[PDB]
Amino acid sequence: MNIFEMLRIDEGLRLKIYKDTEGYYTIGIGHLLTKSPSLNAAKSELDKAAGRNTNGVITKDEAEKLFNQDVDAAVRGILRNAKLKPVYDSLDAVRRAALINMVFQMGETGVAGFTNSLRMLQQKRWDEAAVNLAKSRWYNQTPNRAKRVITTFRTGTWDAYKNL
Ligand SMILES: [Cl-]
Ligand SMILES: [Cl-]
């Protein structure tokens, strides 16, 4: 398993525009197009992102390309963020993947705000961080996914993903 496979499981794959868990227009593998309530706005961001008149549909290869770019950008965002980088550099490879999943879903800002949990992850207090991560809107709004990521941080293995 790896980060790509992990997020492909948590985000799914859809070739026409859809609404994510928060009602925001998205496409592909979790590629947010816009938070605006407007379908035209979304269609227009989609065209600008694909470089062509898409009419709201993309192919598989384009979804995969937006995915590659989004993962690269999540990683680079962590490395440039003063509150995230030290955490990321302290973790082993499986747990790094769990932090990139969080940044992909919620944004660097969002994550950088879990101050207390980041601190515990840095200290390697696994169970504690798990409990703390759970007290969040993130966990109450998308509990199944949040559980998979939290178990990932707690155990340092891909067990929550094996089966899927
Ligand atoms: Cl883009
Ligand atoms: Cl969920």
- DSSP string covering 59-102: -HHHHHHHHHHHHHHHHHHHHH-TTTHHHHHHS-HHHHHHHHHH
Experimentally, how was this structure solved?
X-ray
Q: Which residue is catalytic, options 5, 10, 20, 61?
A: 20
Query: How wide is the angle at C-alpha 150 spanned by C-alphas 148 and 152, nearest 5°?
Result: 70
> Are 1 and 163 spatial neighbours (Cβ–Cβ below 8 Å)?
no
> Are 31 and 39 spatial neighbours (Cβ–Cβ below 8 Å)?
no
Give CA–CA dist 69/75, Å, rounded. 10
* Residue with the two structure tokens 């928060």: 22
**Catalytic site includes residue 45:** no
Distance 37 CA to ligand 2 centre (A): 22
Binding residues for substrate: 32, 104, 117, 132
In which order are the strands placed within the sheet that holds 31-34? 14-19, 25-28, 31-34
Give CA–CA dist 101/15, Å, rounded. 21
> Are 99 and 129 spatial neighbours (Cβ–Cβ below 8 Å)?
no
Q: Which residue is catalytic, options 5, 10, 11, 127?
A: 11
Give CA–CA dist 49/55, Å, rounded. 12
Binding residues: 32, 104, 117, 132
The strand pairing partners of 31, in sequence order, are: 27
CATH for 1-164?
1.10.530.40
